[PDB]
Amino acid sequence: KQYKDCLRLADIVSSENQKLYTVFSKTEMRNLLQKLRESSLMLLDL
């Protein structure tokens, strides 16, 4: 239930320092955004 820290994964993956977004496929990046949306829905329920 650390849903706020789930959303900080978007900042880490998109960071220019580590360029982690370059290792993701377009499919995995879509799946990650869908998973992050599931965590944002639980924050709205709170």
């Binding site: 959303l7 978007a10 900042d11 998109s14 990046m29 879509r30 955004l33 992050l36 949306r37």
Partner: protein
Amino acid sequence: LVQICEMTDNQSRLQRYMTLFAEQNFSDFLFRWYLEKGKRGKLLSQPASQHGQLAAFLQAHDHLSWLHELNSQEFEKAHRTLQTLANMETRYFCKKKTLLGLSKLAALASDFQEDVLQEKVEEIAEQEHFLLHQETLPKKLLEEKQLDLNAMPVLAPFQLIQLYVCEENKRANENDFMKALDLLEYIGDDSEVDVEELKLEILCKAIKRDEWSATDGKDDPIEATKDSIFVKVLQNLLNKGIELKGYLPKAETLLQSEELNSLKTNSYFEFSLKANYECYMKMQS
């Protein structure tokens, strides 16, 4: 009819009424009724056949439209709605940051052409850069001022500058004054704030953080002042490629400032300031 369908849990009957009474705005009535009863989950879980009417209804309700736009895979619209909501959010810093991050993710999930996607990502990245100056405020200064980053408003550039340079920021370093100087670019031409006066204030406050006393009159004033916050700010501006001759106030204008009244009597300060100005101006030429 809505009360009976909700008391009987009869969703198939409710959908039949949305079709039968479509010309009488029954969908708009049902959506208002769900909004007023606080049943937002049922409002957003409507069948795909009703997404057009729900989209039209939610145009009066921006704070909910982005959720429907995301569910409908309309990521370009979700991005714009979230960006407008982020631009309107002044009351909660963490909420503005969350809305920009969601707007960026919506842009990246959309079918924007690469040139347009890059433009929209740069526009958000510029706003994220501004907000990084508020996020990187010293934790001790926030504790002393009783400010919580999670509950505080979005601060204007001038208010952030004041927090970076204020006397209560006892650990202000060259990076805090560099952030205060960087924040000048976010002060619009329509503001009642003189950017040149505020730049003079930031530099005067940087000078006040160091002791300008002659430690044993044998050190080169340029070498003795090298570790000062003001000289490190000059070095950082030069390392950023900024033309010091156009960017800095005249050494005489700093020496005339009412802020520096305690240092005006110090002949070593006057000499050391002029020597640093001449040195760093010659290092750039």
